Amino acid sequence: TTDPCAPVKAFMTLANMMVGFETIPMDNQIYTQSRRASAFSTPHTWPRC
Amino acid sequence: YVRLDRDRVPTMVGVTRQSRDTITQPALSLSTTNTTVGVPLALDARAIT
Amino acid sequence: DCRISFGMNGAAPMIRDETGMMVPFEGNWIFPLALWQMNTRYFNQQFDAWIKTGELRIRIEMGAYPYMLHYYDPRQYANAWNLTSAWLEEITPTSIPS
Amino acid sequence: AYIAVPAVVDSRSSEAIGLLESFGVDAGSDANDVSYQDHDYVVDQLQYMLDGYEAGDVIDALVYRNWLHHSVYCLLPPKSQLLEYWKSNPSVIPDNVDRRLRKRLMLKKDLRKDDEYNQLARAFKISDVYAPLISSTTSPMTMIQNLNQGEIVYTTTDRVIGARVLLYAPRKYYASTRVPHSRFNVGTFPSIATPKCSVMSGVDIESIPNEFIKLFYQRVKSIHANILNDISPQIVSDMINHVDVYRVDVVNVLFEVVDVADGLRSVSRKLIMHTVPVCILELLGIEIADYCIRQEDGMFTDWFLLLTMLSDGLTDRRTHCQYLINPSSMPPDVILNISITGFINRHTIDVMPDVYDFIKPIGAVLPKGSFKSTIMRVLDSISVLGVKIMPRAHV
Amino acid sequence: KRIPRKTKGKSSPATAEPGTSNCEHYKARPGIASVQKATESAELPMKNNDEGTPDKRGNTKEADDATKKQAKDTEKAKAQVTYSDTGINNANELSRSGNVDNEGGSNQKPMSTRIAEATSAIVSKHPA
Amino acid sequence: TLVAQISETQYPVDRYLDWIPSLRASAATAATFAEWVNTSMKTAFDLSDMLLEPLLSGDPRMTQLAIQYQQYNGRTFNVIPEMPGSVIADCVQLTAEV
Amino acid sequence: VLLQRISPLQIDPTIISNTMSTVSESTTQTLSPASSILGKLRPSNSDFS
Amino acid sequence: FPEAAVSRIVVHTRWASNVDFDRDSSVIMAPPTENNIHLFKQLLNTETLSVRGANPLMFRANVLHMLLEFVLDNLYLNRHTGFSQDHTPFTEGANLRSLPGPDAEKWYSIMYPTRMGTPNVSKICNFVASCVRNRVGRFDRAQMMNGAMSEWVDVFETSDALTVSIRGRWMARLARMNINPTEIEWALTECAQGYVTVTSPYAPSVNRLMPYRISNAERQISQIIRVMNIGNNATVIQPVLQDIS
Amino acid sequence: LLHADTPRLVTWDAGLCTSFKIVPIVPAQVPQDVLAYTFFTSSYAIQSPFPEAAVSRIVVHTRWASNVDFDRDSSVIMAPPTENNIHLFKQLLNTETLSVRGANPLMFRANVLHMLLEFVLDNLYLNRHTGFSQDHTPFTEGANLRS
Secondary structure: OOOOOHHHHHHHHHHHHOOOOOOOOOOOOOOOOOOOOOOOOOOOOOOOO | OOOOOOOOOOOEEEEEOOOOOOOOOOOOOHHHHOOOOOOOOEOOHHHHO | OOOEEOOOOOOOOEEOOOOOOOEOOOOEOOEEHHHHHOOHHHHHHHHHHHHHOOOOEOOEEOOOOOOOOOOOOOOOOOOOHHHHHHHHHHOOOOOEOO | OOEOOOOOOOOOOHHHHOHHHHOOOOOOOOOOOEOOOOOOHHHHHHHHHOOOOOHHHHHHHHOOOOOOOOOOEEEOOOHHHHHHHHHOOOOOOOOOOOHHHHHHHOOOOOOOOOHHHHHHHHOOOOOOOOOOOOOOOOOOOHHHHHHHHOOOEEEOOOOOOOOOOOEOOOHHHOOOOOOOOOOEOEOOOOOOOOOOOOEEOOOOOOOOOOOHHHHHHHHHHHOOOOOOOEEOHHHHHHHHOOOOOOEEEEEEEOOEEEEOOOOOOEEEEEEEEEEEEHHHHHHHOOOOOEEEOEOOOOOEOOHHHHHHHHOOOEEEOOOOOEEOOOOOOOOOOOOOEEEOOOEOOOOEEEOOOOOOOOOOOOOOOOOOOOOHHHHHHHHHOOOOOOOOOOOHHHO | OOOOOOOOOOOOOOOOOOOOOOOOOOOOOOOHHHHHHHHHHHHOOOOOOOOOOEOOOOOEOOHHHHHHHHHHHOOOOOOOOEOOOOOOOOOOOOOOOOOEOOOOOEOOOOHHHHHHHHHHOOOOOOOO | OHHHHHOOOOOOOOOOOOOOOOOOOOHHHHHHHHHHHHHHHHHHHOOOOOOOOOOOOOOOOOOOOEEEEEOOOOOEEEEOOOOOOOHHHHHHHHHHHO | OHHHHHOOOOOOOHHHHHHHOOOOOOOOOOOOHHHHHHHHHOOOOOOOO | OOOOOOOOOOOEOOOOOOOOOOOOOOOEOOOOOOOOHHHOOOOOOOOOOOOOOOOHHHHHHHHHHHHHHHHHHOOOOOOOOOEEEOOOOOOOOOEEEOOOOOOOHHHHHHHOHHHOOOOOOOHHHHHHOOOOOOOOEEEEEOOOOOOOOOOOEEEEOOOOHHHHHHHHHHHHHHHHHOOOHHHHHHHHHHHHOOOOOOOOOOOOOOOOOOOOOOOHHHHHHHHHHHHHHOOOOOOOOHHHHHHHO | OOOOOOOOOOOOOOOOOOOOEEEEEEOOOOOOOOOEEEOOOOEEEOOOOOOOOOEEEEEOEOOOOOOOOOOOOOOOEOOOOOOOOOHHHHOOOOOOOOOOOOEOOOOHHHHHHHHHHHHHHOOOOOOOOOOEEEOOOOOOOOOEEEO
């Protein structure tokens, strides 16, 4: 795909199903890690991890 | 295109009908109103695979 | 700033100068065309008799205008007043007859 | 585009009725780009669905429906049936089923008692084959967005908000029980979903004939009336540019009481005379100008008596309360001059009530100072078709 | 010679040859008329987006409908290439329209009509 | 060139004719006049598809063109193609000077 | 459709069918990953636009 | 202006208004040749026998209710359509605002008073020809996007500075209420605690108005009034518990 | 087929490339002295190269002597000034305008610029070689005229 954030989506899709067995650190207390891979569209909201 | 490259990602694609030197009302043409880089297009992943 | 007044008992009709006191209808003047175009219907009813027989040489300003022509025989008598009155009635606050 | 309408509307007969001019839109220019939608079955679906849900969440679901966007259902039979349906005629089987289940269900044998088929049928799921599958009890908010997404949405449940139920199989297997688009369309049950939508306001909500539509409009005006788009008949007209008995068009007048008692106009009070029928107005010839309703003998001019007699009574515009005028010339108050100052609504009602269902005698009770003599004299003077509809002879 | 217009303007001896042959015995392995059947479509240019533009009068002049072309092509009621069911929220989404003129006002009443109303809001007639 | 003639524009233009009166040209007026130019060109060369058609949208009191994008970290890359010769334009200017 | 018309290869899920019609599951088991990926891929379809 | 002998000014809330939704709150005041006493026997003069009477001790209360009615009527927001340039040379080619309705013929004449010609030496003409020419109609606009609605404009038109200030206060209130879809996304996300995700766009916006935000104290006032309402009953709170069940 | 919107670039012309013609307005005739030229017996009448009347003036036509293969349909054609031509100014931004015999005091610049655009625009042609002819008239000798 011509999507720039497609690897971010590729990371998040495994991340959404590994919610609750293996955890990753966040940046603030407003985004639970279990948000979906759909909303990651912008160059921002890419996680530090 | 970029591989895994954060600030090198393009965001907005804009076009101007105005010279650079003199200010006016900001034109800010129609292509910029897309959330991503342009008009989106959904593709079925099944046929791709 | 053109404003027309007239008074009782033989008082001549006055008209407001750009600068000074109101003046009678017996001079060489300058109009831009918008001044006539304010209301042509009021103006020509005020002015046309003094145009016809009075000494009143008005100068409408355009810069540019289209025109038509009408030839005649100078061996005989000619007049313009029907043509000029047709023009000065046909003028309107949107458009100009040539 | 899209616009609401405060009545039931059909693709068939609403063009014969001419609803836009019936609600008062000057659409006499045949612009003919308003495709009337069929919104009669939605009431039947609704009243079927009030037996298992609250009214509120069903209305809150139904408001989001893009009526411009086209969709359809397909009913599915229960789980203990669908294998037996796919057994006979195994041609129509989707490819989402299972390789193992297709190998199990392709052949001829009756397969009634074999542990392979029993563990597969117990292993069978209905929602992995067909992806939407709204549910048995689905919290029906979500089904509107499900119908907004797909052109077809699958269900096993009869009760639905939506366009058309279609059957997946023949009827013997069951339990107990595309479109052309113009540039405009009307239709009741509006939507907030559409960026472009409008709602035909102007009509009173107290005077809606149907009650389901009345409940719906009460809810939609009591929640997110900020984001709605109430437009007048004039706005609708500017955007534009077997005949029935007992459905008369009916309006409401806007007069007030004044006097000229001292050589001067003087406004005292303002009144509203509800649901007066427009046919009597246009056949009596009532306009905006100043009238005198009581002639100088002391008795009414009786056209105003007729005008309030065919209609119902009076609402004061400052108190919103009842008001019943003095029929005497005593000086607490009288009414000498009126001036009707406009009309407010243009809905149509049924005329025949619910109770009168057989030809049998009719009794009416009245208060003691009712205008019995004068109404007998008015019905005495009725001549319409060479026939007297109410003679004096049998009153 | 004369060439017609496409639009409507403002008025309105020699012996036996040794080595030519017509044996035709080669098949075009991609399939040549099929490639031109695609290539005429490839040649077809796009249409215009003429909304948001006036006419010579002066007055100004698709998620459900763009999918329908693909649903007509593929001989399938569904569609794979879609312009809806997209995770990208383009809730801003300026699409040009005849709602707005070139200035920034609205178009409930057309431009030439309100120019005429403006210039007729001051007229003058002859007295009696 | 012609819109810079009829209204204000930063564009350096030769300005041959001025004594012909005009007005303070607004967006709707400029859009109409530019469409008359567009349809004149289109019917004169018998194009049928388009030219300048979305450029006949918004306010057409304009200058040279430019298209650009921006990265994430505020960096903007524009491209401005320089202007080649102007055959019909300076023919218009030549006959206007005549 | 122009690239589909010119491209030398051809797509078929008969490779999928030949690969996956080999494998099967024993007759006492409630789930099989082979049949699962066959149902998810739907190799009976031929749509590759 | 009406070319009469005597002209007085009277008071009408919204006589030039193509409204969206009426408040049913209009204040009519007839000219002083005729009577206006019903406005002052409005509230507490339920005991005046004659139709033309009013207790003077009720004057202050009636006038307070009438002023409240006056300000409570015109609580709308000014919406704009239709800019066009004239071709008459009456102005300096100034852009004039249109307005919907049946006609617009009398409306421009009543709206822009210095537009008219100056023929006579009447009091009207002597007033008008001493005005300023450039202060007519449009003089400012805020254009965000190409080929779209100018977001807010500034016009020279006839008005009432009283109701202009009232509409300005109401506009400031609503602007204080206004919020951002990014923080609606934030709020609903952390309210759902990550079990439900939501999506807000990231692009230039046209302009929006979401009036949803208030202060903490107003929530506290509303909660105190509500708990004071449901006092010592339990049949008002039984269906709440049933709904939550 | 050639699907794309191809314009018409190259265009030919066989007539005159002038764009100004000379009308007479009021006709006239005089007592002529010498009528025709006599060769041996044949008489050749005198033909003036343009009109000869009482009052003559130049009007403006675009391609009044042209044998074009393909017009551009953009000609400006103005009448002699005994009658008006003010439809030419009326046609462009007088977008409502009553009194058909009028034209705006404010649209003159737009009108003139559009007329000049049309005037340059209906001249984009070439010049066909069109063949010649030799003369031996004693009033121009040996000149190879253009047929």
